[PDB]
RNA sequence: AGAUUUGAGUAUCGUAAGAGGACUCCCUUAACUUAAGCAUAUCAAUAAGGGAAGGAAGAAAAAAUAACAAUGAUUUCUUAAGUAAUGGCGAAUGAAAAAGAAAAAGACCAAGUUGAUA
RNA sequence: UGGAAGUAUAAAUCGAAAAGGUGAUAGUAUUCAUCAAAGUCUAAAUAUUACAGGAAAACUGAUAGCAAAGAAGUACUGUGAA
RNA sequence: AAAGAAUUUAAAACAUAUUAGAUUUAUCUGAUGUGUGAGACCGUAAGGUGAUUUCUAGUUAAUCCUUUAAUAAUAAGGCUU
């Protein structure tokens, strides 16, 4: 909508809101980021203070799908499920029948510990795991299982 | 068969045998015109696998060029340019002899399609090729299943647009794979595609 | 230049919802411009089978 | 029940299946070569890595050899190559 | 922010518009109609495997490939020469890359076949092959007397221990330990016993019916089931598999490795 | 004299040329500009100069990817992605496998064999 | 060239094979994986502001819109390119 | 010393043996064969056995990270000063 930008509303004003004694002229101290190093320093000092040097090594070709591994904390195992087959399967134990939540198929590979789970046994398989979240997993009951 | 003896032996270049032999058809193409016919290939077996078949419409060109490096065609060897784009000498051509060599003898013979070429020989001075030519109106050729494709009208002067073996090596079209990521198919063409900025009709 | 807008599909049912809603308002429809003052209900509509006649 | 992801045993459990096809040359190879080196000869490196051989300079030969072939492994073969000549001879 | 545009060259000549796009469908949608009037099969998309994509991160999904490789074709007694003219894809520069790769996708070409009506040659009654058909059906009804008396008295044993199986489960969602371990102990039995000669091609189904006109197979042969909710039985082995320490005894075992070659030098 | 090889003149039947070049395939070592100077770099396969094509052209059937529960000619679109990388590591330049679609198609020479050989 | 101890092309010199190439950090070795270069053709999906024929438009409405709504690349200028 | 079933039928690479032909060269070309490479544990008797993992005690080896199929000795790149 041009009819609410600035420009209307400053028709009659000279300089269009710029100044007069501080013209609108073409540049500005450069074109792109110019002047890095020399006289805007104090900004890439201020606001992006580690902008020029190097750091870490160089992967000539990064395969970027061997770091791919999505992750899923203890607390949210059951939500890929549903609550309705977490109550219905709320009263078992060693013995008979125990959901499996296939953290694979729902697209997590890895699984880790936060929170808290609810107390009923549980079958988790996965690719990976993590100390804290296989602890949290057996401490309620349950078991880890591996996959690919 | 035959031909596995001369493939065999035409590896041994180096040989007495080769070289004497080579010697005496390169000092013979010294004199005789640029470009002229021949009435058979000097070495069958490599004529023969390029696709010259001894029937009626084949015809075989001879081409002498002279090999090296030329300089920068500026008036004096004066050029004004940077630094960067000061250089007369050490510049190569990005198009290989044998190429050349084919552009001059199709322009040459402007109603023949070159088929293919190969080397013969070399001296201090000189690099002699041999190129094969169909005639694409001869009966023989048109009514052969087999070779009517060189009778469309897009093969008109194949080695100009870089149809040829020895023009498309040196086009980039020797391999396949991420060693030749920018000649895809056709290195203008993939520069172009890659540059293109889509401006679809629901963008953010 | 950009002459197409988008808009999501959930923002866009919503306003067919709203609109339709407003369609059964007496007052909305005629203050619109509409003379429904003789008209039966005001989402008025009519049989399947006389339809199929015309 | 699924394998394991990490390790050299790695990978879901399935029975992986190709024959590691040899390109080789037929027994009358050897005829096409006895006839065309007779008829050609040797090349000029060729006759020098027999001098340096002849001497007993093996390790010359191969620094002779990669010299003028740019690789390690097809200067050991043309060394070897060169070698079932002598003792021919 | 520090910027980062592209805009210092050309754009103005790079900029590529999709006023077209519009008018691609009606254009790829109209040649799509114009090839099923000409000949149905062809638009059909011919059937083409159920291929695993690559990579870890991809490697649970299964689509489609390109081309039954030549040991799939004999496995499901398809000669390679008829596949292609009858809607099959055939890539041989396909390597089988597992048995179950193998089998799965046998399953697939079995299963075109059998929806699969390939119309006579020619149109005519006269047909060669309608009329071999006449001649052969009297001894296909001998040969398919055979075929029923076998796959009737070979697979019985297993047959009502594997209905048992169904009412007992069926019983339990209104045991199955000893119900599943009969059938187990016959399947074994049962794989012991067929350790003998196929024909080495099938019969290509050819007959005279009313053209129902299908755009594809792909979409009839489904690449994966539905997938429900697996569920499974705990035991006190499975609490105590320990899976951290599997992983880490895997990792530390192929990072020793160096440390093994490094110390027979020695 | 005769048998060949090679090279010419003439005759017959045809063939190339020139126009156009928006899109297509290429040859060539521009500079203005940016880097707040400038000399590598950028502008830039960009301007101009030159050649060759068709209704489309180019490419096309792995000496290709990957390290997987693996794929499988070419082409084009989405994503990867302003990412890996390149760079007075400054200004700036910058892909591709995977994955999702449009369309789908594979065949030949050379070499080898058959030679009362055609 | 994004290709970094050399991704592609070309030139000078050199120059293979009882095969071999690739796995992008140079080198040697042993395994593994995957292909089999140095000849050719091949429709379909794709591009288009030459030009011709059409259809549309939140475009301009005679200092606007093509330079040109009339005998417009016309009248007129230049030796000429223009 | 303590817990520990391990998932379930369509198969090719060839390390080979043993034969049917051809060859002399740096020799090859078919087929038959076992293992390899294989994984359904014995239970209606409580469940034992048993791969594979854990802890403790000596032993020999490697040990800052990377060169993206796996290692090695050279080389090169990372991190801190």
């Given at each position: 909508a041009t009819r609410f930008r600035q420009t209307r509303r400053r028709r009659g004003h000279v300089s269009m809101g710029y100044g007069r004694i501080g013209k609108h002229r073409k540049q500005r101290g450069g074109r792109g980021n110019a002047g890095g190093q020399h006289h805007r320093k104090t900004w890439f000092t201020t606001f992006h203070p580690d902008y020029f040097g190097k750091h870490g090594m160089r992967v000539f070709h990064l395969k970027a799908n061997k770091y791919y591994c999505p992750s899923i904390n203890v607390d949210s195992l059951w939500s890929l499920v549903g609550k309705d087959v977490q109550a219905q399967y709320k009263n078992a134990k060693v013995g008979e029948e125990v959901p499996v939540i296939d953290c694979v198929k729902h697209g997590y590979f890895k699984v880790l510990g936060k929170g808290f789970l609810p107390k009923q046994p549980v079958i988790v398989r996965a690719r990976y795991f993590s100390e804290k979240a296989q602890q949290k997993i057996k401490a309620v009951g349950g078991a880890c299982e591996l996959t690919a | 068969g035959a031909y596995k003896y001369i493939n065999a032996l035409n590896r041994?270049?180096?040989?007495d045998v080769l070289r004497f032999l080579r010697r005496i058809r390169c000092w013979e193409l010294r004199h005789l015109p640029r470009i002229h016919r021949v009435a058979r290939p000097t070495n069958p077996e490599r004529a023969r696998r390029l696709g010259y078949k001894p029937k009626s419409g084949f015809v075989i060109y001879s081409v002498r060029i002279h090999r090296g490096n030329r300089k920068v065609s500026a008036r004096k060897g004066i050029?004004?340019?940077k630094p960067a784009c000061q250089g007369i000498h050490k510049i190569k051509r990005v198009k290989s002899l044998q190429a050349i060599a084919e552009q001059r003898v199709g322009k040459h013979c402007g109603?023949?399609?070159?088929l293919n070429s190969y080397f013969i020989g070399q001296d201090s001075t000189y690099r002699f090729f041999e190129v094969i030519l169909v005639d694409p109106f001869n009966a023989a050729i048109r009514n052969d299943p087999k070779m009517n494709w060189i009778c469309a009208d897009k093969q008109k002067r194949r080695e100009a647009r870089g149809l040829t073996s020895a023009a498309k090596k040196s086009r980039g079209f020797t391999g396949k794979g991420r060693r030749y990521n920018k000649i895809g198919a056709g290195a203008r063409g993939n520069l172009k595609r890659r540059n293109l900025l889509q401006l679809k009709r629901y963008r953010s | 230049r950009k002459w197409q807008r988008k808009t999501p599909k959930q923002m866009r049912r919503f306003a067919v919802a709203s609109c339709i809603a407003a369609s059964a308002v007496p007052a909305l429809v005629s203050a619109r411009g509409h003379h429904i003052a003789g008209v039966p209900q005001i989402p008025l509509v009519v049989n399947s089978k006389s339809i199929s006649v015309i | 029940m699924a394998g394991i992801a990490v390790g050299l045993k790695r990978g879901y459990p399935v029975h992986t299946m190709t024959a590691k096809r040899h390109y080789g040359v037929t027994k009358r190879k050897h005829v096409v070569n006895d006839v065309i080196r007779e008829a050609c000869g040797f090349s000029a490196y060729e006759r020098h890595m027999m001098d340096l051989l002849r001497r007993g300079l093996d390790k010359k030969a191969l620094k002779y050899a990669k010299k003028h072939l740019g690789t390690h492994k097809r200067g050991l073969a043309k060394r070897d190559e060169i070698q079932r000549a002598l003792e021919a001879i | 922010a520090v910027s980062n545009i592209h805009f210092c060259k050309d754009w103005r000549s790079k900029v590529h518009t999709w006023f077209k796009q519009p008018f691609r469908k009606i254009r790829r949608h109209q040649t799509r109609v114009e090839k099923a009037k000409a000949?149905?099969?062809?638009?059909?998309k011919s059937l083409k495997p159920s291929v695993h994509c690559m990579n870890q991160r991809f490697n649970y999904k299964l689509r489609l490939g390109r081309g039954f490789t030549l040991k799939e074709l004999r496995a499901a007694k398809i000669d390679k020469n008829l596949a292609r003219t009858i809607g099959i894809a055939v890539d041989?520069?396909?390597?089988?890359?597992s048995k179950e790769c193998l089998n799965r996708n046998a399953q697939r070409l079995t299963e075109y076949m059998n929806r699969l009506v390939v119309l006579p040659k020619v149109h005519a009654a006269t047909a060669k092959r309608l009329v071999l058909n006449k001649k052969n059906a009297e001894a296909k009804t001998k040969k398919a007397a055979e075929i029923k008396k076998f796959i009737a008295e070979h697979n019985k044993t297993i047959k009502e221990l594997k209905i048992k199986v169904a009412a007992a489960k069926k019983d339990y969602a209104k045991e199955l330990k000893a119900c599943l371990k009969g059938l187990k102990k016959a399947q074994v039995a049962f794989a012991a016993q067929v350790a003998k000669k196929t024909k080495q091609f099938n019969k290509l189904p050819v007959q005279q019916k009313e053209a129902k006109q299908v755009l594809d197979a792909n979409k009839v042969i489904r690449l994966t089931a539905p997938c429900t909710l697996e569920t499974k039985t705990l035991t006190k082995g499975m609490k105590a598999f320990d899976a951290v320490a599997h992983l880490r005894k895997a990792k530390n075992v192929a990072k020793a490795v160096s440390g093994i070659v490094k110390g027979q030098k020695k």
């Open positions: - | 041994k270049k180096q040989s050029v004004h340019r109603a023949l399609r070159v | - | - | 000949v149905f099969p062809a638009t059909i041989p520069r396909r390597k089988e890359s």
